[PDB]
Ligand binder design. Structure first.
Ligand code: HEM
Ligand code: HEM
Ligand code: CYN
Ligand code: CYN
Lengths: 191, 191
């Protein structure tokens, strides 16, 4: 039903496993408290996803060198591409909140990294676009993504601590995932 | 006077320039407001740097797979290595606050990336240690670094907005720099 969304039906096993994930979670100070707070945040954000997506792609569309990654060769945004990616991003927000971070989760994170990278970019949607998303922007996007998310987390009326715990859990989870997605970009053996 | 600190005397021009930097600053939503707030934060943090360093290396030392990157071949921390890096980290905190982010700043960021990477790791201090810091941990460290910094920013008694503006400026600046440092790790042409 969501075109191109292949969580749990990926073709490849990730080159990282649950032991790697344990060690990476430690590097981002993610614990069981964060698991609980990310799940709570899912409940807060669930009815807000359309507006989150409009704000997020508003930012991407606000800078030509960012919108660039969704463009057709003629430099104009590929509207099919954008709309199809948007649907999978909506799922990713929910998955971050509700999935057990197990090997199927890791296999999908590897797949998402491959889809930003030249390895698989443009294949899922069968579009003609830019071959690769420069890595420098994947890392950079940790910031604006967390900044876009923060105001939404307030709105179900929660204590300041709860809201900071949810935002911080999202900052950890975002950093964790972007780190995983780096794999196909990194010189073999340097990751 | 600070061994190995070669800001402004680097051997190589960075493969990125001030136009790249403009585009990356936009990707992390860094503006002139952030320049002002990062400078303000420098004034707040200046007398606190020793304690920041003790807290930061407390975290690194708290996980064997992280402390690993400062170890001698026998698996024990190289104390010379740690102490020498600590001095340059102290400078980096101040430089983030006070340097114009120009080509000399970029050339040093390239150098810092090279020093985490196998390209130059262990050369500055002439130590025998792990050849490479896996990239996955450079990205991950954005989180704990910002989390370690946050409580220090409170303590000169500033408004909540001011403190959040300073923390957010530091989160942007950290993300920006780690993105730059990724260069030698990334497959040529994918950055
Ligand atoms: C914090 C960083 C980022 C997050 C959280 C994120 C999130 C996502 C998600 C969830 C998807 C869909 C994955 C799937 O197919 O199921 C996706 C795809 C995509 N993203 Fe990102 N992304 C990030 C960085 C970037 C950057 C820097 C760009 C550059 C504008 C970008 C542009 C795209 C594009 C063009 C696709 C489609 C890739 C393809 O052809 O399959 N993303 N992103
Ligand atoms: C947010 C991420 C990070 C920040 C802000 C940071 C900061 C720094 C700074 C400022 C230096 C000294 C640069 C110079 O020589 O002037 C340095 C060196 C070093 N860092 Fe990091 N670092 C980060 C990620 C990491 C990670 C993930 C590790 C793994 C423990 C690590 C371990 C080291 C080591 C071993 C050196 C010495 C490298 C060499 O041999 O020259 N750093 N770091
Ligand atoms: C990516 N959105
Ligand atoms: C790196 N400390």
């Amino acid at each position: 039903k969501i075109p191109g969304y292949t969580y749990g039906e990926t073709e490849n096993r990730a080159p990282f496993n649950l032991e790697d994930l344990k060690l990476l979670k430690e590097a981002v100070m993610f614990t069981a408290e964060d698991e609980e707070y990310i799940q709570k945040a899912g409940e807060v954000l669930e009815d807000q996803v359309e507006e989150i997506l409009d704000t997020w792609y508003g930012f991407v569309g606000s800078h030509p060198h960012l919108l660039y990654y969704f463009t057709s060769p003629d430099g104009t945004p590929n509207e099919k591409y954008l709309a199809a990616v948007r649907k999978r991003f909506s799922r990713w927000i929910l998955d971050t909140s509700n999935r057990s971070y197990d090997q199927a989760w890791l296999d999908y994170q590897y797949e998402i990294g491959l889809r930003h990278h030249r390895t698989k970019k443009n294949q899922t949607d069968n579009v003609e676009s830019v071959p690769n998303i420069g890595y420098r922007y994947l890392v950079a996007f940790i910031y604006p993504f967390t900044a876009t998310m923060k105001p939404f987390l307030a709105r179900k009326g929660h204590t300041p601590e709860e809201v900071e715990k949810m935002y911080q859990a999202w900052f950890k989870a975002t950093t964790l995932q972007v780190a995983l997605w780096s794999y196909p970009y990194v010189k073999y053996g340097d990751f």
